A and B are shown apart, each in its own frame.
Chain A
Amino acid sequence: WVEESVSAITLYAVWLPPAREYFHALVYFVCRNARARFAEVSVTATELRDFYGQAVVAAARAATTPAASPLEPLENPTLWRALYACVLAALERQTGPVALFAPLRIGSTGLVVKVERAGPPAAPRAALLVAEANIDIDPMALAARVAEHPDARLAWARLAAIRDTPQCASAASLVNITTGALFAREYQTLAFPGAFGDLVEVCEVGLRPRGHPQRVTARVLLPRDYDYFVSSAPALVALFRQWHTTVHAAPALAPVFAFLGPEFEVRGGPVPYFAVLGFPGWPTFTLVRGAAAAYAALLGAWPAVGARVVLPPRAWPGVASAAAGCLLPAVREAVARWHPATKIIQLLDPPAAVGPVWTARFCFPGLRAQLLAALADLGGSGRTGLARLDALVVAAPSEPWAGAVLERLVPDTCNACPALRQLLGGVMAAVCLQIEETASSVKFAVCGGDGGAFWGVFNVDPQDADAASGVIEDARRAIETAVGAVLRANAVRLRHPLCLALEGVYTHAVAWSQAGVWFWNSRDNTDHLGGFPLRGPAYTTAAGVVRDTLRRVLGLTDALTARGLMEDACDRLILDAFNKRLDAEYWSVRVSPFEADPLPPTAFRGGALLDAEHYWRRVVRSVGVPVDLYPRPLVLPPVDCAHHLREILREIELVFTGVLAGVWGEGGKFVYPFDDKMSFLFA
């Protein structure tokens, strides 16, 4: 019952007891007074499979991590996401509620036996970390990987090589850890020759685990005066691997040494993170109050474990069905016949334009996350992660960090569930049929959207006057209260009461695709454009041009004069693109690991810059150049500005064909003569 405050929770050992399925784990606590403790947990085969969606002998032969073998998670990443989420569930289910950085009651065999909740806690101190390393990976081995895995991000190939020859991290140049002391370290070769004692404290604790018939001895590194780092994957890996090889030299027990990050998957992963779930004992956050708070709220498993923060994968079908049952049978028929491409509300069928009217755009902020949290409680009939989602929901509105998590959590929650999408899709449908039904009565006419974000024309307003704020206010209140009433009427209970945002009041709008809509206010020349790709800097200059062009074009209130303005805009755009005909980084597009240029072999020797390639590849073009796998400054043939302007002109021509068809009823697709005029500039 020491009143303390856990700073990190990290997996130390994972073994099978003498006899048989119930693998144990030993966890490391970084505890601080107003110290280093441990807890033991058991996990069954079923709980593991639940958090995975395989076998416990394959999660105890991940006790080959207690050695130089560096990236054992690359072998099977979801196995580690599983093992860590399952330990963090067993620990709350056996030791009790556990909350990083928060005041706590700790009842310690030396193993912490109970941790019930319970002082002003010590504010988390931060340590800065700058580290750089020169791993010598042979760039013909780094091309064999991508020969096997044609979409492989090269941070992954880099790590996979560092996995196939561990010794690359031994002979590798390599740190400056500032801690408010100072820890610099030369390493010409990291296996050869401030104090490592004023940065960490080496603690040995004696333990007597139930599933181990001996007085096991755990050696740890207790941070002093810092609780986390703030910041290269191969670089940190090899640093911490040196620390491990050094500390765990003499006879005692050896920790796990497992890390996870987007670099550990073949196809990458959009967001950066470096998940420590093993040896060192504390995180490395690669503002920063955001990562700190996300850490603390989701017990540090996010984004490491994925959607397993909220609820196991294969316990989602149950909640899906259960929540489905609680809904009103009309809504349930909606939830059962949802298919992604359906026309629920009649919308303005593009191409279409709305002229002088009191156009408005309202959005129900964070509705998808609110729905998921409510449907989780409705399907509840273990709930530690359900509470974690609700927590982010009640903070997301005012804490921006929580939003980024949900914006990735909700999509990733069904990046797995294939039927929780139907609950989301079907209840989404009912949320739209109301709003339509209420808009019938509040002088609003839904013109497009999805039901958490929508826009329409107030076709009763006098196209003028100050009695327009009043009507939009009445409409927003009516739709807020009606959508709230509907969601209640189905027993969906929302953490915090809906707010219907008013994200702008406009007076013209043109719609040219499903997602493509431009808005404009004639009273004050303010606009919004959505639906244009922003695949690079060229595309943001292009989007600015499309916005200014549409302002003039709707300032004309024939079609031919519009086409004159459009071709004038395209002309001036191509010329100003000529001024930037050398700027490679400007013409570079971002290409996902899913959208199919091949790699030059010369890029395979970009050294420690391949390790920054986890999601996007930024390519210019005719032959493709990954502008980031080469040192700076580039030395290039002329950039294929005709190829790139052709792409951009195709998108601008979608926009312009839409506007001409929608506003003036021209059947004429707008076309720009490029090969005829302005092609020569790039020949």
Chain B
Amino acid sequence: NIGEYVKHNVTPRETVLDGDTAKAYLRARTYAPGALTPAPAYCGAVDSATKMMGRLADAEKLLVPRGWRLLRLAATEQQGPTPPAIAALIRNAAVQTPLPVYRISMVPTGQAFAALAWDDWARITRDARLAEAVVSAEAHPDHGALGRRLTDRIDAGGQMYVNRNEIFNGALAITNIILDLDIALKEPVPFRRLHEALGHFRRGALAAVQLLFPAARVDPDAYPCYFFKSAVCSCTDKIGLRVCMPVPAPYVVHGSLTMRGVARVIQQAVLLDRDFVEAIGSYVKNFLLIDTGVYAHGHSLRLPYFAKIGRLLPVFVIPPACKDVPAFVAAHADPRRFHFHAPPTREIRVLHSLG
């Protein structure tokens, strides 16, 4: 079973913070409450590798008390009651931290980084957003049916807008369970088969999520799991998915090893669902569906709505017994639902170890 695996092979450590220390922890170790709320234009620090190393060197001079490029950008966080320390690099004074850091592949080669206090998320996700009316008129009762039909409808400072990888910052907490599926497959796969296979991914993974987070009312019907499939399937060799789940209510996860453990448990739980491996087997060569080593500090995951140098676009696997379908569709666009260290949407418990 899976109870057995999470009875022997996982050792939870949780620390119930409470009262004001809860708010302090949330504000301190997650992105600021406006880092992922949309904005008319970006205030950020975007340049190539070399120009970023320079701009860091030119920010050090402004940082006289501080000692003395993907550790240092990921390091530059604080606030105080004055502007934060990043503001020497970003060059505004109304920046707020912690704030995202991104790795940007550039044509023809080379890497750029972008620490940004806010961005225009509509410019990124308007050519993927279904109008509230189009949803509300799509009229299609069965949720496999509605999900599948809705899926049917659908310079460094410019290159950030087609390739953007999010960098894990182990200083920060984790509020979302960002899985990185890499299903390799021998014969191609239709899309209704995949869509139903994902309906069976969500159910098993939510059972795993509920075992790992015991004091959480994670109803395996309405709990949101957000799926993005990299662009009929037409996809041979490899089929890249991305599954993002909110961390359940009172929990937050801390650690690279803690989230490596969460991912591996979800992997074994979905491989222990007999339905999933029927629905998806005989197409799938390997079975390692989850690169649990992507949660290491300094490592990057391509974000939804960004290509590769396949736009990760949603596959609405609508919850069984969902409640407000317009809202579930709309959340595939809020950046908070697909960044590691986002603000969560009394006490909290921090799962800082699994073993």
Q: Which of B70-106 contact A (CB under 8 A)?
A: 75, 78-80, 82, 85
A636 and B17 form a contact (CB under 8 A) = no
Question: A581 CA to B66 CA in the complex, in Å?
Answer: 16
Question: A678 CA to B21 CA in the complex, in Å?
Answer: 13
Within 8 Å of chain B (Cβ to Cβ): is A564? no
B-binding segment of A186-194, A277-285, A339-347, A625-633: A625-633
Question: A538 CA to B280 CA in the complex, in Å?
Answer: 58
Question: A432 CA to B351 CA in the complex, in Å?
Answer: 58
B65 and A625 form a contact (CB under 8 A) = yes
Within 8 Å of chain A (Cβ to Cβ): is B352? yes
With an 8 Å Cβ cutoff, the count of chain A residues facing the other chain is 25
* Best-surrounded residue of A635, A676, A678 (most CB of chain B within 10 A): A635
Question: A631 CA to B75 CA in the complex, in Å?
Answer: 22
B254 and A683 form a contact (CB under 8 A) = yes
Query: Among the listed A575, A625, A638, A679, which residue makes an inter-chain contact with B78, where contact means beta carbons less than 8 Å apart?
Result: A638
Within 8 Å of chain A (Cβ to Cβ): is B24? yes
Within 8 Å of chain B (Cβ to Cβ): is A637? yes
B67 and A637 form a contact (CB under 8 A) = yes
Question: A342 CA to B170 CA in the complex, in Å?
Answer: 54
Question: A351 CA to B116 CA in the complex, in Å?
Answer: 57
List of B residues within 8 angstroms of A397 by Cβ:
none
List of A residues within 8 angstroms of B78 by Cβ:
582, 635-638
Given contacts A602-B65, A625-B65, A680-B254, contact A633 B21 (CB under 8 A): no
Q: How far is the CB of A657 from chain B (nearest CB, A)?
A: 24
Question: A576 CA to B67 CA in the complex, in Å?
Answer: 27
Within 8 Å of chain A (Cβ to Cβ): is B64? yes
Q: Which of A626-683 contact B (CB under 8 A)?
A: 630-631, 633-638, 676-681, 683
Given contacts A582-B80, A683-B170, contact A635 B255 (CB under 8 A): no
A579 and B24 form a contact (CB under 8 A) = yes
What are 15 A-B residue pairs whose CB atoms fall within 8 Å in the complex? A575-B21, A579-B24, A581-B28, A582-B78, A625-B65, A630-B64, A633-B80, A633-B82, A634-B65, A635-B63, A635-B78, A636-B66, A638-B78, A677-B15, A683-B170
CB-CB nearest in chain B for A680:
B352
For the complex of A and B, the 5 pairs showing the least CB-CB separation, nearest first, are A680-B352, A630-B65, A634-B65, A623-B67, A680-B254
Question: A637 CA to B71 CA in the complex, in Å?
Answer: 13
CB-CB nearest in chain B for A603:
B65
Map CB proximity to A onto B21-35 as digits: 1 under 8 Å, 0 otherwise. 100110010000000
Question: A602 CA to B67 CA in the complex, in Å?
Answer: 8
Query: Among the listed B64, B79, B350, which residue makes an inter-chain contact with A602, where contact means beta carbons less than 8 Å apart?
Result: B64
Within 8 Å of chain A (Cβ to Cβ): is B171? yes
Query: Among the listed A575, A576, A636, A677, which residue makes an inter-chain contact with B65, where contact means beta carbons less than 8 Å apart?
Result: A636
List of B residues within 8 angstroms of A677 by Cβ:
13, 15
List of A residues within 8 angstroms of B21 by Cβ:
575-576, 578-579
Within 8 Å of chain B (Cβ to Cβ): is A600? yes
Q: How far is the CB of B172 from chain A (nearest CB, A)?
A: 10
Question: A248 CA to B152 CA in the complex, in Å?
Answer: 97
With an 8 Å Cβ cutoff, the count of chain B residues facing the other chain is 26
Q: How many A-B residue pairs have CB under 8 A?
A: 54
Question: A76 CA to B170 CA in the complex, in Å?
Answer: 55
A635 and B65 form a contact (CB under 8 A) = yes
List of B residues within 8 angstroms of A625 by Cβ:
65, 67
List of B residues within 8 angstroms of A637 by Cβ:
66-67, 75, 78
List of B residues within 8 angstroms of A602 by Cβ:
64-65
Question: A422 CA to B293 CA in the complex, in Å?
Answer: 69
CB-CB nearest in chain B for A623:
B67
Query: Among the listed B15, B28, B64, B66, which residue makes an inter-chain contact with A680, where contact means beta carbons less than 8 Å apart?
Result: B15
Q: How far is the CB of A318 from chain B (nearest CB, A)?
A: 54
CB-CB nearest in chain A for B81:
A633
Known: A581-B28, A600-B67. 20 other contacts (CB 8 A): A578-B21, A578-B24, A579-B20, A579-B21, A625-B65, A630-B65, A631-B64, A633-B82, A635-B63, A635-B64, A635-B85, A636-B66, A637-B75, A638-B78, A677-B13, A680-B15, A680-B255, A680-B350, A683-B170, A683-B254
Q: How far is the CB of B160 from chain A (nearest CB, A)?
A: 27
List of B residues within 8 angstroms of A633 by Cβ:
80, 82
Q: Which of A601-641 contact B (CB under 8 A)?
A: 602, 623, 625, 630-631, 633-638
CB-CB nearest in chain A for B170:
A683
Question: A579 CA to B18 CA in the complex, in Å?
Answer: 12
Question: A679 CA to B255 CA in the complex, in Å?
Answer: 11
Q: How far is the CB of A334 from chain B (nearest CB, A)?
A: 55
Map CB proximity to A onto B288-307 as digits: 1 under 8 Å, 0 otherwise. 00000000000000000000
Q: Which of B37-51 contact A (CB under 8 A)?
A: none
Q: How far is the CB of A136 from chain B (nearest CB, A)?
A: 17
Q: How far is the CB of B333 from chain A (nearest CB, A)?
A: 32
Question: A579 CA to B24 CA in the complex, in Å?
Answer: 7
Question: A625 CA to B15 CA in the complex, in Å?
Answer: 31
Question: A602 CA to B171 CA in the complex, in Å?
Answer: 26
Question: A434 CA to B66 CA in the complex, in Å?
Answer: 58
Q: How far is the CB of A645 from chain B (nearest CB, A)?
A: 15
Map CB proximity to A onto B248-263 as digits: 1 under 8 Å, 0 otherwise. 0000001100000000
Question: A582 CA to B85 CA in the complex, in Å?
Answer: 13
List of A residues within 8 angstroms of B350 by Cβ:
680
Given contacts A635-B85, A680-B255, contact A575 B67 (CB under 8 A): no
Question: A635 CA to B66 CA in the complex, in Å?
Answer: 6
List of B residues within 8 angstroms of A679 by Cβ:
352
Map CB proximity to A onto B322-355 as digits: 1 under 8 Å, 0 otherwise. 0000000000000000000000000000101100
CB-CB nearest in chain A for B29:
A681
CB-CB nearest in chain A for B60:
A602
List of B residues within 8 angstroms of A630 by Cβ:
64-65
Question: A625 CA to B66 CA in the complex, in Å?
Answer: 8
CB-CB nearest in chain B for A638:
B78
Question: A636 CA to B65 CA in the complex, in Å?
Answer: 6
Query: Among the listed A623, A631, A634, A681, which residue makes an inter-chain contact with B25, where contact means beta carbons less than 8 Å apart?
Result: A681
List of A residues within 8 angstroms of B25 by Cβ:
578, 681
Question: A581 CA to B65 CA in the complex, in Å?
Answer: 17
Question: A581 CA to B255 CA in the complex, in Å?
Answer: 19
Q: How far is the CB of B272 from chain A (nearest CB, A)?
A: 30
CB-CB nearest in chain B for A633:
B82
Question: A678 CA to B14 CA in the complex, in Å?
Answer: 10
* Best-surrounded residue of A625, A681, A683 (most CB of chain B within 10 A): A681
List of A residues within 8 angstroms of B80 by Cβ:
582, 633
Question: A243 CA to B40 CA in the complex, in Å?
Answer: 64
CB-CB nearest in chain B for A676:
B13
List of A residues within 8 angstroms of B63 by Cβ:
635
List of A residues within 8 angstroms of B82 by Cβ:
633
CB-CB nearest in chain A for B173:
A680
CB-CB nearest in chain A for B350:
A680
Question: A600 CA to B65 CA in the complex, in Å?
Answer: 9
Given contacts A578-B25, A633-B80, contact A683 B65 (CB under 8 A): no
List of A residues within 8 angstroms of B353 by Cβ:
676
* Best-surrounded residue of B24, B67, B254 (most CB of chain A within 10 A): B67
CB-CB nearest in chain A for B20:
A579
Q: Which of B1-22 contact A (CB under 8 A)?
A: 13, 15, 17, 20-21
Q: How far is the CB of A578 from chain B (nearest CB, A)?
A: 6
Question: A600 CA to B64 CA in the complex, in Å?
Answer: 11
Question: A623 CA to B67 CA in the complex, in Å?
Answer: 7
Question: A92 CA to B82 CA in the complex, in Å?
Answer: 61
Q: How far is the CB of A600 from chain B (nearest CB, A)?
A: 7
Question: A633 CA to B79 CA in the complex, in Å?
Answer: 12
Map CB proximity to B onto A568-585 as digits: 1 under 8 Å, 0 otherwise. 000000011011011000
Q: How far is the CB of A137 from chain B (nearest CB, A)?
A: 17
A683 and B171 form a contact (CB under 8 A) = yes
List of B residues within 8 angstroms of A582 by Cβ:
78-80
List of A residues within 8 angstroms of B67 by Cβ:
600, 623, 625, 637
Question: A299 CA to B254 CA in the complex, in Å?
Answer: 66
Q: Which of B164-178 contact A (CB under 8 A)?
A: 170-171
Question: A677 CA to B17 CA in the complex, in Å?
Answer: 11
Question: A34 CA to B305 CA in the complex, in Å?
Answer: 93
* Best-surrounded residue of B15, B65, B78 (most CB of chain A within 10 A): B65
